[PDB]
Write a protein that binds this ligand. Sequence first.
Ligand SMILES: Cc1noc(C)c1[C@@H]1C[C@@](C)(c2cc(-c3cncnc3)c(F)cc2F)N=C(N)S1
Length: 359
Amino acid sequence: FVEMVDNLRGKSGQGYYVEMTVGSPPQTLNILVDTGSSNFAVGAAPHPFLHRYYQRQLSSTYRDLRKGVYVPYTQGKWEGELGTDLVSIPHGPNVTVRANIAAITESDKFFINGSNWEGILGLAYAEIARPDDSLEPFFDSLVKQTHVPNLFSLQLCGSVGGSMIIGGIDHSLYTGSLWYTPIRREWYYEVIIVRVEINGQDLKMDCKEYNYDKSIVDSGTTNLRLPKKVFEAAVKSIKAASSTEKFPDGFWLGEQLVCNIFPVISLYLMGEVTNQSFRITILPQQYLRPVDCYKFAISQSSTGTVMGAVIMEGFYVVFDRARKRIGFAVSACHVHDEFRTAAVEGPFVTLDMEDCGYN
Ligand SMILES: Cc1noc(C)c1[C@@H]1C[C@@](C)(c2cc(-c3cncnc3)c(F)cc2F)N=C(N)S1
């Protein structure tokens, strides 16, 4: 998997993209790697922000599905025309598959002005695919049509770079051992957090709060998002541990910027074995992001916990779809200092972990 190493590029806060080819002859596009969605959607019209776009008229292998798709998000929206075409990943496996492609024809607050990507690769499951679950996601098409193993792994390094290893794991990308947490349900990459520690101090909350209404691993989100009740308890603990310096209330709410004092954040995840868990620890270097101007990258959420780039940049993350599990290991590229480092530690004894999941 040497040729797949360093195949990700991007800019801080703008996500991580991979080079892909679409159609025949192949059209080169930069595509956002997103484990928090399930559609392969690409710009297909000359939007001013786009360096390039999918030109269906130039592709002999393009097939029209004669169906539209409208996708509104919490913020922003895109509308596309559905079809299929031959797709390949130059710095991935040496294969070409026929995959569903949403040709984006209209959008608002979707593409980022100044970004170098013009499409999105939804790596999650068909359950959250749009318009419905009958539209096969790219990775499902990839596994069905080739002998590529049903697994991919991500090393996101905090302009920015990283690696997407398709069909396997590269052991040079991590130190120590991988620790696996079960995928609760195949829609998002849903996991269960069982305990949260701020500087080794437990929040003492009902663990069901940590996963209300869900907890997901999402490469297409910058922040570590937490449920409001968990967020206000977490922020209060972070306020106390950094009592040396005083910061405005707007800073903690992500309404303003700030220009050893900050605590580590540990998330205990459900293990592979009954009553067994493991913990992942992130540093201030992960949740205090440069914009020296810094933005507090922990925010309140209405859709549950989102383990975004804040979490993922500290670790090598294995999306083991074949075994319905997600592996975490200390990243060989994560940003740290001489006193503290990101950690993956286990095993720990945690009881009533099934009560933490919301139904
Ligand atoms: C769900 C959801 N609900 O409200 C919003 C906003 C979303 C996002 C949808 C999506 C598709 C998305 C992400 C980014 C991005 C931004 N910054 C760094 N990386 C990716 C973007 F620019 C545009 C996007 F459409 N990917 C996600 N995981 S979250």
